């Protein structure tokens, strides 16, 4: 009864800070412009549109247990995970005339 | 309720009854290389890319 789950589905507009999903375990991995909190909750780093994709999973080399699992896989095997992305909707800014010096 | 895959599901081809007989990655780098190969390949599922997208000459050089 912890109320954890997806808060923003695919195609939902998000603002920076908005929590995409709370999970407890890494069900959905953070992708592009998606931060991860201490509690493993995913949040938008940018204002944009939420997308879910399947991407190839390459763990950090320092991550011992994951690397072990990787090194136990057959030669053709690649691991896939679900990833949450934010496609940014607005440009960083614009150049406008302020002084006709 | 289930829907069949719209293409070849990954890791399907290499799936054999005998796994001990099959050669494995022993290194992080080998898996990594194969991973980039897969990443570059087109896929039927939603991807990140979709949203964020002379003989004389030879002889002379060999001699050199």
């Amino acid at each position: 009864g912890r109320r954890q789950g997806i808060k923003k589905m695919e195609g939902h507009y998000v603002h920076a800070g908005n929590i995409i999903a709370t999970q407890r375990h890494f069900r959905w991995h953070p992708g592009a412009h998606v931060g991860v909190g201490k509690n493993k909750c995913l949040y938008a780093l940018e204002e944009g549109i939420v997308r879910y994709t399947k991407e190839v999973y390459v763990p950090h080399p320092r991550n011992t247990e994951a690397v072990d699992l990787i090194t136990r896989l057959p030669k053709g095997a690649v691991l896939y995970k679900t990833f949450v992305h934010v496609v940014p909707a607005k440009p960083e800014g614009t150049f406008k005339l302020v002084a006709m010096l | 309720r289930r829907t069949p895959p719209l293409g070849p599901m990954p890791n399907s081809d290499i799936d054999l009854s005998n796994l001990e007989r099959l050669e494995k990655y022993r290194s992080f780098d080998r898996y990594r290389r194969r991973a980039e190969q897969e990443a570059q390949a087109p896929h039927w599922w939603r991807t990140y890319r979709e949203y964020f997208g002379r003989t004389q000459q030879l002889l002379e050089r060999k001699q050199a």
């Binding site: 896989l73 896939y80 | 289930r2 895959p5 799936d15």
Partner: peptide, 19 residues
């Protein structure tokens, strides 16, 4: 997701036998 055709795309430990 179960209903979707991309169900079980992240199945990993059928490939390994940790016995």
């Amino acid at each position: 997701y179960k209903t979707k055709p991309t169900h079980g795309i992240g199945k990993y430990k059928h490939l390994i036998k940790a016995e």
